[PDB]
Amino acid sequence: TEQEDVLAKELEDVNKWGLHVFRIAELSGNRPLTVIMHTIFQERDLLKTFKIPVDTLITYLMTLEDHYHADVAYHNNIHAADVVQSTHVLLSTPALEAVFTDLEILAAIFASAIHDVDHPGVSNQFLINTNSELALMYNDSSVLENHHLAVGFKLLQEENCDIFQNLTKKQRQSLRKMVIDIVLATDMSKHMNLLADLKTMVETKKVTSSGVLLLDNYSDRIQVLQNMVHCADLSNPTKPLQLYRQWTDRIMEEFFRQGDRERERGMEISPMCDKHNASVEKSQVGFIDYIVHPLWETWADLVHPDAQDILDTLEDNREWYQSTIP
């Protein structure tokens, strides 16, 4: 049909920063995670390399996508599809050419795919303060992140869902460790420590004459992949304004719902969660100045000069939001 044709046309931009992910979600019948993952797996030749039966891949991905909540405005299948595709573009950065193996590329993409699965739309601190079963289970540390990992891996055991069935036992062990390491690093309470170590690597940075990153041990390699997916998770303000504003609208809607829960329980309403006392534009400038820019400037330095266009878009967007403040 015309819908399938226009979908295939949008997917041609899968290697570009600024893919029309919302449009893809609409055209695919709300299956952006399934179709983008499938497209990326074919593009990187990941099915033949790891002998993943195509029917097995689709079955797992549709199941995975079903476990992201439709009624959660930001942390849903669209956010997952976006982080996956953003990770995919960062992996193709010239400074990282031939740096990671096929197993590490699969780990980073699969981790991005599951990184927020089954998100209930409330934060770690909210789950802790409300004496929830999740926080009780995970002893108050990376409560959501440990949960997203458990569900992402448990789903592989459903009928015809084990996409890793043809990997060796050692390959399975290695991928699992890498995925756990990456998803735990998406907990914002770890942001400051990741960034500091990223800056340390930037100072001691070793490269070839063409500027390709030389990363020999696990510690250095997993550190770059953790920051890569972390950067993808914090990529909304670096995308074309039309996309960023939509993400902003969704996170504010999610945060206000949490704030509405906090108000009726008699709790102190969390930052940016009070719809009656908000400053959406100031909060975005604050988000860029204190979190997103310091991270992306450091990443830019690691892969100089390949991230220059991403950084320019970030500063343009910051300038625009600032202008909306009287």
Ligand X SMILES: CCOC(=O)c1c(C)nn(-c2ccc(N)cc2)c1C
Q: Which residues are known catalytic residues?
A: 75
Q: Quote the least distance from Cβ 74 to ligand X, whole Å.
A: 7
Closer to ligand X by CB, 31 or 250: give it.
250
| Amino acid in the structure at residue 228 | M
Smallest CA-to-CA distance from 254 within 239, 238, 272, 268 is with 272
**Residue 116 assigned to a binding site:** yes
d(CA 23, CA 7): 8
Q: Quote the least distance from Cβ 179 to ligand X, whole Å.
A: 17
Applying CB under 6 A, the residues found at the interface with ligand X are 186, 188, 233-234, 236, 247-248, 251, 287
Compute and round to an integer the Cα radius of gyration of the chain: 20
Smallest CA-to-CA distance from 140 within 150, 148, 130, 152 is with 130
Which entry of Zn ion, ligand X, Mg ion, none binds 247, CB below 5 to 8 A by partner kind? ligand X
Q: Quote the least distance from Cβ 173 to Zn ion, whole Å.
A: 26
- Please report whether residue 116 would count as binding Zn ion according to CB under 5 A: yes
**Residue 246 assigned to a binding site:** no
- DSSP-assigned letters across all residues of 268-287: PPPTT--TTS--HHHHHHHH
Among the listed residues 10, 104, 116, 254, the single contact to Mg ion using CB under 5 A: 116
- Please report whether residue 82 would count as binding Mg ion according to CB under 5 A: no
N-term to C-term CA, the chain: 48
- Please report whether residue 262 would count as binding Mg ion according to CB under 5 A: no
User: Can you tell me whether residue 138 is helix, strand or coil?
Assistant: helix
Q: Which residues bind Zn ion (CB under 5 A)?
A: 116, 233
Q: Which residues bind Mg ion (CB under 5 A)?
A: 116, 186
Q: Which residues are annotated as a binding site for Mn(2+)?
A: 116
